[PDB]
Write a protein that binds this ligand. Structure first.
Ligand code: G6S
Ligand code: G6S
Ligand code: G6S
Ligand code: G6S
Ligand code: A1APC
Ligand code: A1APC
Ligand code: CA
Ligand code: CA
Ligand code: CL
Ligand code: CL
Ligand code: CL
Ligand code: CL
Ligand code: CL
Ligand code: CL
Ligand code: CL
Ligand code: CL
Ligand code: CL
Lengths: 577, 577
């Protein structure tokens, strides 16, 4: 067992870490840092071609690459790690045990453009904005904005842009994503820019807008990528920025994120923490626990636990099928391997039909995978059918955790195994708890079968411009499949408190077995309804729904919309009427 | 020794080759095709991250990847291989012997946009063009041209654009490169498009323009990439298209290109053959022979034999130095290795100062290489000095070859070893025989020391809109170095015939030992002089130049310009007065 110790010796710690990690030989490593501030530049970092699910693949500069250990552990002792430019801070591949603790991650210059809206001229199609300085960086050239200008890198456009409350640093009431692609930007002097372009949705005067650049390059790497690993514990790890997601796990098992978080630095002038998901779990297995953590100000969801749907491309022989990934940021994924159990899904029926066990895999390229199964394939397997990995699904628990003031859904749940969401505090621009099995664009699997959402506080939820709900069960399945079959099952939503401004509470589509019980809804938020006459509850194409012992306080609101087939099995004790 | 034989079995030969080549196990392989037309798609091709000098690195789809053979041979028996989309047709890595023969290479849809210029409006900034159809592909979407729209790929803009003579399929007289970046293209009906943008140089009406797309993605891969191989023979191999160079060799030894070529298919509607260099030799050694070949209609040089200049970044210790690549398409190059001899060049002096021998190499990333030498480094080695690889330089012979009707220089010569250019037919838009050691942008090495250019025919040379010459000796060295030191040496230009229209014959800068003798210049080409009062010969900052027994026939032309220091050692027998 090797033990490496480090101190803040050089202005760029990357070469020192790079050299030490290269000479490691033992399969058990522990790295200790003396409490201090360490800066890492990518210039002299190791570079490898990497495959990163739900990010862009490519050549990456990597600061910490820990591959193949029996156990590897990083003790930050409260240090702060400052990164620079396009770099992947941490990669843990192929480790039988991983622990990182007591560390703060941040960048020296964020990959964002943040500006206060001074005025909007919709008639002439421009807006005037004052860019936030702090440690943001940008300039003008060619009549357009360039940012962040780090190591010679600049985005082409501001890209997808969102309006935030300047004081609360949360998304504005009614906020809608707006794509900025302006070729015409003037310096008006005194630090004011005039951005010429017509927008479908302009930002409100006085708000701060965020921009994270071009869709095709701004998912560079998460702060942590864990691949093919086991027994992973993050403890007192705080992320202030990343060029992608915060904690990303692929094909890994038994994960704990404890007393950790993704949020803004107290007193800073930052608006965005991670530019994508705070936490993300792609085809993991074993157990996942998020406890005592805090996720704020990301530009995407707080958590997404899900697997991959691959698409049957052709049948090779009686035991061998070739599948394809469906979304461009899934290519390069390690879908399966020897001894995995796999579900077959046959058009046009959305359900898991049968199970088989993988004998071997021939990865053809990053898009196509040839899988040979131990048992004969189903006779009805056809091109366009789906494979879902059955082995690589986790149990999932989130408790005593805060998720608020960010862009997107708080919690996105797609595992078929036991899921517990309890004793959390939630506040979400979009839906708070969202279910979306997806075979249309994202190809993310996860018809659920056992989910308990209880004793949480939902405060200020679903204030986006587009319609959302506190609990939103909404699969989006390819038109090659029937659109009215039961998908998710056995969801319980018990004893939560919802502070509301008139938003939807539950929207359920194709759920079989949904209990909404013991909840208190407090219409006590002074903000305007953005979708008039939205019911508290709406159910379409579902079965065995029960409303029980809920309470509504405040100005009246439409309670129920239910279609005829769901009404047939709706138990409703009239708790709210 | 394995022998694989194939026949035109399926619409897509890629899977059959992929599977067969994956199961080869002997170190001696021969692949035989029955004479026919074979088509290869990238969809199911193997994908690997590849490093390709003077191209862009990244994930490549690869049809033939032959790695590590004692001997590998491909016998095409006159077959035609048709490729499709973004694919690398052939890769030969780490092979002790390579032979390819009797094969024609082409694409089903070229990655070019070609159009006849119908009208130009310089006041309003537009041009009307009719796209050539043939097997070109393109459309309009978002108000601009998309091409080639193959497997979902399209360039952003037309990119680097050049005008050609419709009937000769060569660059127009006075042709100049023009960047096309037009956001506004409309269909005027009748197969005519209007391209809105202001150009510094407009194409002439009646000319065909070629466009090859965005600078940053159009160097995808050469038709052939040969890396770390030796004893390589191409014989009767013809290339009609590639997404890059035709024959590219890196760190390879003893190469012959015999009875081969890069040119347009007779009777086709193509204008461009390869979108980059026909042949290219990056830090090869041993001998290179090009004989009885034919290179036409490329969008870059016919041949460039050259090495790499790396830049000293850091002195690590008494024996170890870290260098950096200078041009962005050189990163990932394999600069050196154990037992290589290396030249050191110390600012501000351009000359090779001392030699050392490499003990080991520690590749840090694609930009930075750490080199440990067997002997102590020079005391005066400093950041910004250069290393040149001394071992990896070849002898070079081109004979009985035709190079004409393409964009750029015919032959670019940067090896220090014996070079012979004889009995060829050259016609060139730019300079025909060009010398450019380059430590400013391209970082390409070789001050030459022994070059013989004799018994060639130069017919219609240097008709570009910018000034060039039949023989052009023009280093381009960083301002960190003295700008008036002798660089190239011992160049002889003997017994050639030049049909001229008034162009320069010799422009020489910083040569020591130049002989121009026995040449016949016939002013017999009916084309306008574009650079008036250009002398036949011009020498600056050179030594030991001799004009001897030359003859000029036709309308009078200024003969000589020479600075005072070159005049001091110029021998001129007045044969051209
Ligand atoms: O993101 S991954 O592609 O899985 O990275 C792991 C791989 O990195 C690649 O760059 C290497 O060439 C492979 O040997 C392998 O180690
Ligand atoms: O990550 S994004 O760039 O916003 O993805 C864009 C996509 O969003 C999806 O919800 C739509 O179904 C797609 O048709 C596409 O518009
Ligand atoms: O262009 S090169 O980088 O030299 O290619 C050779 C390499 O390809 C990479 O994709 C592999 O991970 C390496 O194992 C090696 O095979
Ligand atoms: O082939 S290209 O890469 O588009 O050429 C662009 C380059 O041309 C060179 O001659 C210039 O000196 C460089 O400064 C650079 O602009
Ligand atoms: O189908 S979903 O509506 O849940 O969207 C899936 C999508 O959610 C987030 O945008 C992530 O950043 C993406 O990588 C992807 O997981
Ligand atoms: O310094 S030079 O003027 O000879 O230019 C070097 C340059 O020449 C061609 O453009 C090649 O395609 C490039 O890869 C590069 O070799
Ligand atoms: Ca990816
Ligand atoms: Ca390259
Ligand atoms: Cl190292
Ligand atoms: Cl900077
Ligand atoms: Cl920010
Ligand atoms: Cl692929
Ligand atoms: Cl219904
Ligand atoms: Cl295969
Ligand atoms: Cl196509
Ligand atoms: Cl063409
Ligand atoms: Cl690099």
């Amino acid at each position: 067992k090797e033990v490496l110790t480090f101190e803040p010796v050089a202005q760029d710690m990357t070469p020192i870490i790079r050299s030490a990690l290269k000479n490691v030989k033992d399969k058990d490593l522990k790295i200790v840092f003396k409490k201090g501030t360490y800066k890492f530049l990518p210039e002299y970092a190791s570079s490898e071609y990497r495959r990163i699910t739900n990010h862009g693949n490519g050549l990456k500069k990597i600061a910490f690459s820990l591959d193949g250990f029996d156990s590897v552990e990083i003790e930050g002792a409260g240090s702060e790690f400052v990164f620079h430019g396009q770099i992947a801070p941490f990669e843990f591949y192929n480790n039988k045990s991983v622990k990182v603790s007591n560390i703060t991650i941040d960048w020296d210059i964020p990959f964002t453009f943040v500006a206060e809206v001074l005025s909007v001229n919709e008639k002439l199609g421009y807006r005037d904005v004052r860019p936030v300085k702090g440690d943001h960086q940008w300039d003008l050239k060619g009549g357009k904005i360039r940012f962040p200008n780090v190591d010679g890198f600049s985005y082409n456009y501001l890209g997808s842009t969102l309006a935030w409350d300047k004081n609360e640093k949360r998304v504005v009431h009614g906020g809608i994503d707006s794509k900025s692609k302006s070729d015409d930007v003037e310096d008006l002097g005194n630090g004011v820019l005039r951005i010429h372009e017509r927008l479908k949705d302009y930002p409100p005067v006085g708000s701060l807008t965020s921009s994270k650049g071009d869709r095709e390059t701004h998912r560079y790497a998460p702060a942590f990528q864990v691949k093919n690993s086991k027994n992973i514990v993050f403890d007192n790890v705080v992320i202030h920025h990343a060029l992608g997601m915060g904690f990303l796990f692929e094909k890994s098992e038994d994960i704990q994120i404890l007393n950790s978080g993704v949020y803004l630095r107290d007193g800073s002038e930052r608006l965005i923490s991670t530019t994508a998901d705070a936490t993300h779990f792609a085809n993991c297995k074993g157990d996942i626990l998020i406890e005592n953590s805090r996720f704020e100000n990301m530009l995407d969801d707080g958590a997404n636990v899900h697997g991959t749907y691959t698409i049957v491309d052709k049948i090779i022989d009686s035991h061998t099928v070739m599948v394809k990934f469906g979304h461009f940021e899934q290519t390069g994924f390690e879908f399966t391997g020897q001894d995995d159990e796999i579900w077959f899904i046959h058009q046009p029926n959305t359900k898991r039909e049968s199970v088989n066990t993988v004998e071997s895999v021939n990865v053809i390229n990053e898009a196509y995978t040839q899988i040979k199964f131990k048992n004969r394939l189903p006779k009805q397997l056809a091109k366009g059918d789906l494979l879902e990995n059955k082995t690589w699904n986790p149990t999932f628990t989130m408790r005593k955790t805060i998720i608020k003031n960010h862009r997107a859904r708080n919690v996105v749940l797609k595992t078929p195994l036991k899921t517990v969401i309890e004793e959390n505090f939630f506040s979400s621009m979009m839906s708070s708890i969202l279910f979306r099995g997806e075979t249309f664009f994202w190809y993310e699997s996860g018809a659920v079968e056992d989910v308990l959402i209880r004793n949480n506080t939902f405060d200020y939820v679903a204030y986006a411009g587009k319609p959302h709900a506190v609990l939103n069960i909404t699969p989006r399945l390819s038109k090659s499949f029937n659109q009215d079959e039961i998908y998710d099952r056995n969801i319980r939503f018990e004893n939560n408190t919802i502070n509301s401004f008139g938003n939807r509470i539950v929207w359920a589509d194709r759920v079989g077995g949904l209990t909404v019980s013991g909840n208190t809804i407090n219409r006590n938020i002074n903000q305007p309804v953005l979708h008039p006459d939205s019911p508290l509850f709406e159910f379409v194409n579902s079965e065995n729904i029960e409303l029980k012992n809920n309470t509504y306080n405040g100005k009246v609101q439409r309670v129920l919309i239910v279609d005829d087939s769901s009404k047939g099995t709706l138990i409703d004790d009239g708790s709210i009427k």
